[PDB]
Design a protein around this ligand. Sequence first.
Ligand code: A1IOL
Ligand code: A1IOL
Ligand code: SAM
Ligand code: SAM
Ligand code: NA
Ligand code: NA
Ligand code: NA
Ligand code: NA
Ligand code: ZN
Ligand code: ZN
Ligand code: ZN
Ligand code: ZN
Lengths: 115, 115, 301, 301
Amino acid sequence: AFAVDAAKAYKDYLASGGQPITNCVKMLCTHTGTGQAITVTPEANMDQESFGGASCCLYCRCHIDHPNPKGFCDLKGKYVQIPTTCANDPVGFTLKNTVCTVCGMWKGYGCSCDQ
Amino acid sequence: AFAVDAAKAYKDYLASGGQPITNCVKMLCTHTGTGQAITVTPEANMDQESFGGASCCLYCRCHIDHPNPKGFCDLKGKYVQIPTTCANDPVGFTLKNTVCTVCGMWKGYGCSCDQ
Amino acid sequence: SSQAWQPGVAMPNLYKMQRMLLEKCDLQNYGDSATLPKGIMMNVAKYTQLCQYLNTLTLAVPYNMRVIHFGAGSDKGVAPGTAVLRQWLPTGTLLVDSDLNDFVSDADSTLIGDCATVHTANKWDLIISDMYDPKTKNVTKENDSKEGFFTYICGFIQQKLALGGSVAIKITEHSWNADLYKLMGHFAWWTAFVTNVNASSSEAFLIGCNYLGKPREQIDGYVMHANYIFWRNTNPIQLSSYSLFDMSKFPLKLRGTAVMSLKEGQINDMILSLLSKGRLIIRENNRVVISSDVLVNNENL
Amino acid sequence: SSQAWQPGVAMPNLYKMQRMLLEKCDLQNYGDSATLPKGIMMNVAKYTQLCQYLNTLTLAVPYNMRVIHFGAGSDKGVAPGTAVLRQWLPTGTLLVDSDLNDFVSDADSTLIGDCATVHTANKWDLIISDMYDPKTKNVTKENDSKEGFFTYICGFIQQKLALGGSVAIKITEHSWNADLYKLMGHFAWWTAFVTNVNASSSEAFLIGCNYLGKPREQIDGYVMHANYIFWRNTNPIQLSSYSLFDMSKFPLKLRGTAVMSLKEGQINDMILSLLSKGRLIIRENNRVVISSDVLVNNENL
Ligand SMILES: CC(=O)NCCCC[C@H](N)C(=O)N1C[C@H](O)C[C@](C)(O)[C@@H](n2cnc3c2c(=O)n(C)c(=O)n3C)C1
Ligand SMILES: CC(=O)NCCCC[C@H](N)C(=O)N1C[C@H](O)C[C@](C)(O)[C@@H](n2cnc3c2c(=O)n(C)c(=O)n3C)C1
Ligand SMILES: C[S@@+](CC[C@H](N)C(=O)[O-])C[C@H]1O[C@@H](n2cnc3c(N)ncnc32)[C@H](O)[C@@H]1O
Ligand SMILES: C[S@@+](CC[C@H](N)C(=O)[O-])C[C@H]1O[C@@H](n2cnc3c(N)ncnc32)[C@H](O)[C@@H]1O
Ligand code: NA
Ligand code: NA
Ligand code: NA
Ligand code: NA
Ligand SMILES: [Zn+2]
Ligand SMILES: [Zn+2]
Ligand SMILES: [Zn+2]
Ligand SMILES: [Zn+2]
């Protein structure tokens, strides 16, 4: 019944004042993109930065298994858009937040399906 | 500065009443062996069980990196002798205990270099 | 009745000489289970008894022996059989294992994926296979020779087993292959061995002892499997774990068997005789390099 | 002076035609650094400018393009260059990368180990290498042609690059190989390209554009490297990151270049002409399978 909870470990490490994971790979892009959360190519808008997906995945970066039963990665091989105000901690951001399955924007950072 | 502490996670999981990791590979042997902690072949004495090393390694079993800088495993490819009274939790035992570098017995379970 | 203190029972020579038709396998003690020592898994007991039986044959045991083990993972994610093989084999023996799914192992190297993706430059002294697909136990369809991983194994033996080397390949009533039986005739000796702890199962290990690289005898594989089932159908084997309690002579004795590099033309009758007796291995003695093929593809857009 | 708005500077043809002796490289602006956009790593900027320059050449861009990237890991454990390559390449492009040490990557498949252990069945449309050993920057010893991974790369190009494909191989003053320069003459066109963000370094990318599989011109590699250093020594390049701010035309245009399977005898002058223009790729179109050799050994007793 034992499984390491890396997600909770990182969350608690951040709460206690630990420095966010660094060296996430920020891409050059137009910043005139769709603003969707996770895309096949950088899609940052004016208020976002785009990063290589693998480098923003806690499981990829920590060399641990992915929480999927198939062990598949949401981010590897794609690009993740992070709000510029949150780009000091892309791993934290992707961990804590969730993508709307309807419009593809980050819930609470672009999703407007609630009106 | 962030690193998962699987050793502490397992220790805390055990403290809280979680069931020890199962399916450690117990070997058939004479039980007339040297009783040393970690050996190239099963060396259980009358008061020990011998297990395949990899299956008693928290890092091997959890698919996470080994705490060595080179990532080398103390147990993989060898056999670990566990006191019979402790054989319900070989991963816990090897994690919590330390091998005497002089005689090769478990400190406090065979080591008598202190007299 | 002495069989209960043996590690298992080998198919008696007279049954090998028959010409039976294939029947359904009906074991008297199907469903029964032997009583294992406290806390010992079936697969540890099974491999222990297999190794105890192999101790009675003329295995070549060279310095820097090379052993590969297919089907080495369990549904528990560990490798019980590999751990018994490593206990059995001399210390320092190069052990490689493989399985379709991920598992943690005591082998010196583990390859994950279908066995067909496994490639090796060098030759081996001993090949162990526990590969098995339980889907084959379909009693409602005819029982024909199977391909799949058995095709790989036959090719691997002909291409990568050293002369003088040996094999043990797990089969069952439905998991079997005619060419593999035919290939048993390319060894100095062969049998089908049933472990006493698993005697209520149609499982056996097909053992080829001392590889000769050419037919020593012609074996029809469809007939031989029918002979094997006939033997199993008419000779109940009493479940037993007795041999598990005496491990004092378990270690495979390091015979220091000689390794020689030889070419096709130089394998005369004197060499063949040495091979047949477990006194010689023929293969290069280079370093051991292995790899698994990885299929690459990009599933985006 | 317009060079500052380019992604970099390519070695001018007249310098390629010289016959200089090899000198020490002395860059006017050694030690200076360009001012990168906020939070952008040098290696992202470097690969972006390299891809911007490659956009000006006649690259073949087939459907289901195949790209392999050697030296793809950083000391940070991630793969910045691979991420830029994947941004640049059409979506769905098969991307494989490799490095000596472990790293996490956006490539479709990553192989860890010395490049010499990397094997592939299939041919590639584009080969990128950033392999580099900083130990070569030893100024106190003579500067001779280097082997090591350059030997692998030359063989990989001759054996595994599709006709019509292209390469970009990182070199420096001391990290270079004469045969690789010679091999540049087996492409329809070649250059040494210096990125504007790294112009204070003797680094360049040796680019072979549209592979022809045979010498189109004879190049002495010792002389050509001397020509390259002469150019660098006499043409200061102003550090610049200007081109990083305009990415609207960055994506490699999917030209749908035709792929054909052809045999040695059928490569006439019409085909060669098509290859030379980036209008044709010649290789099988099977599935992509890769592997890395693993050395096996048992260090017990
Ligand atoms: C005294 C009393 O009440 N006993 C009645 C209950 C007996 C229960 C036991 N499961 C049994 O013996 N049976 C009952 C079947 O009807 C006959 C059959 C199918 O041939 C048996 N059987 C033999 N070897 C078998 C199989 C078999 O299915 N399979 C799948 C095999 O692989 N093997 C090797 C199975
Ligand atoms: C106005 C004022 O006070 N400036 C004085 C301070 C200048 C500092 C700067 N580091 C420099 O230019 N130097 C000073 C050396 O004495 C001359 C030398 C060795 O040739 C220079 N240099 C040129 N290209 C170089 C190298 C070099 O070492 N290496 C290793 C190269 O790879 N390349 C490509 C290095
Ligand atoms: C009976 S289990 C063997 C368990 C293992 N020997 C042990 O000691 O517990 C059979 C194994 O064969 C493997 N197998 C079946 N078909 C295979 C194939 N085509 N290639 C590789 N492995 C295969 C399965 O994954 C399964 O784990
Ligand atoms: C300049 S770094 C490249 C970093 C990477 N391209 C990036 O985007 O940041 C050079 C790399 O080449 C690798 N390398 C050097 N020699 C090698 C060899 N013989 N085989 C494989 N990789 C090698 C080193 O491990 C090193 O990480
Ligand atoms: Na079966
Ligand atoms: Na053998
Ligand atoms: Na250098
Ligand atoms: Na190309
Ligand atoms: Zn991931
Ligand atoms: Zn939405
Ligand atoms: Zn371990
Ligand atoms: Zn001691």
